[PDB]
């Protein structure tokens, strides 16, 4: 199949900014590139057909260009209703295929995370498992390094991160990192530490606790 490479995966736009993003076909597709917008919880919506032809009812700030393999969608002054995912699609030959998408997010000033660590509850321990939660609250940009250290051993493969959608009021993200261990593994160790590196922190932040203390 023809592969469409969309770049970047994430593009940060300040309102009133002229932005563009890219769609590259793995082989010649002439002008048969079409662009879609998908708002959160919505369906794809066709915006541009055949690389440059704008659909009716589609705002004029949207414009597309390109031919051959490299295509561009431009928004000349982004509005807050344009915050969405954007997909390209080729119809040059069968089967028809889509790019992986470019997500447009709201650019704002850097904001450091507030970090919190939660030991497993006694309830859960009684059930035989231990979850340790490290919370990064209201930060920007989205990129953050969270490392678990248990009695000074860096943890790998036993934690999962989850990240909220961008907040509608302050444009920040929040992130949870959950370390999951068996009750027996949890009780082999004393010091549980979450270390957070983020652009907004002058030095990385560690929150920690001694198992079974307070």
């Amino acid at each position: 199949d023809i592969l469409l490479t969309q770049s970047p995966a994430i593009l940060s736009v300040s309102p009133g900014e002229r932005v563009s993003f890219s769609c590259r076909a793995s082989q010649f597709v002439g002008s048969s590139i079409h662009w879609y917008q998908q708002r959160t919880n919505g369906s794809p919506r066709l915006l541009i057909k055949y690389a440059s032809e704008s659909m009716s009812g589609i705002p004029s700030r949207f414009s597309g260009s390109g031919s051959g393999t490299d295509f561009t969608l431009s928004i000349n002054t982004v509005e807050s209703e344009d915050i969405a995912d954007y997909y390209c699609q080729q119809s040059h030959s069968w089967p028809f295929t889509f790019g992986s998408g470019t997500n447009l997010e709201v650019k704002r000033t850097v904001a450091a995370p507030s970090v919190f660590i939660f030991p497993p509850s006694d309830e859960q321990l009684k059930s035989g498992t231990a979850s340790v939660v490290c919370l990064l609250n209201n930060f920007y940009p989205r990129e953050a390094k969270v490392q678990w250290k248990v009695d000074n051993a860096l943890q790998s493969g036993n934690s999962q991160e989850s990240v909220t959608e961008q907040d509608s009021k302050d444009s920040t993200y929040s992130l949870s990192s959950t370390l999951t261990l068996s009750k027996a593994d949890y009780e082999k160790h004393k010091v549980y530490a979450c270390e957070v590196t983020h652009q907004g922190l002058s030095s990385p932040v560690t929150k920690s606790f001694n198992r079974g203390e307070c």
Binding site: S43, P44, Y50, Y87, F96, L135, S162, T164
Partner: protein, 217 residues
């Protein structure tokens, strides 16, 4: 106004079968090429199957990944297109859109999507554990909502009275095949001795409703 309206999604085990349906209005249905396109976080948007107009023998086409397992059909008298799925795989999980393709070009109208979940996990209500405010300005507390299936749960705080500062994280699928998430909220430290904090967890598929008081340990 063109409308497309899918139905028939749901939960099914691997090896199972399910039929999706879509009803169209606002264009001459029998003239047009109807498609199913699916969307997942891992594979993005994937064209699945197409059935063209009877005027061209209503020919069917399938993506390689579903050929032999899925069957697309149409009933012009009902303005309906269908997707019959068999031998379902976990990676067939996704949101399935009914869509019109305009004669081999754009997907110019799309439905609202219907959700397919292929999983052998059994339906199960969550356990709810406190995330107790740390004994050491602003305090964070919350609820851990663990080991439920399927999506979704809903979490409110103090019956909906408490909304600002709530972050309910997207659920994450664990290797057990069960979901887990946390709901947290930041509140003034001074309000810890004046205000009770209760998370209300509702899991409709298991008729589970849990209220968990969160307090300093």
């Amino acid at each position: 106004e063109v409308k497309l309206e899918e139905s028939g999604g749901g939960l099914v085990q691997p090896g199972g079968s399910m039929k999706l349906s879509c009803v169209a209005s606002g264009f001459i249905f029998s003239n047009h090429w109807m498609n199913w396109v699916r969307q997942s976080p891992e594979k993005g948007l994937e064209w699945v199957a197409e059935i063209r107009s009877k005027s061209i023998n209503s020919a069917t086409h399938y993506a390689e990944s579903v050929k032999g397992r899925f069957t697309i059909s149409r009933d012009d008298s009902k303005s309906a297109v269908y997707l019959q799925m068999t031998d379902l795989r976990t990676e067939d999980t996704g949101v399935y859109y009914c869509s019109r393709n305009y004669y081999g070009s754009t997907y110019d109208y799309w439905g609202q999507g219907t959700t397919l979940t292929v999983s052998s996990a059994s339906t199960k209500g969550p356990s709810v554990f406190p995330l107790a405010p740390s004994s050491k300005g602003t305090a964070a507390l919350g609820c851990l909502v663990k080991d439920y299936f399927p999506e979704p749960v809903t979490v409110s705080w103090n019956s909906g009275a408490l909304t600002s500062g709530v972050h309910t994280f997207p659920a994450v699928l664990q290797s057990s095949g069960l979901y887990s998430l946390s709901s947290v909220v930041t509140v003034p430290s001074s309000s810890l001795g004046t205000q009770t904090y209760i998370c209300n967890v509702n899991h409709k598929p298991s008729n589970t409703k849990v209220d968990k008081k969160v307090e300093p340990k």
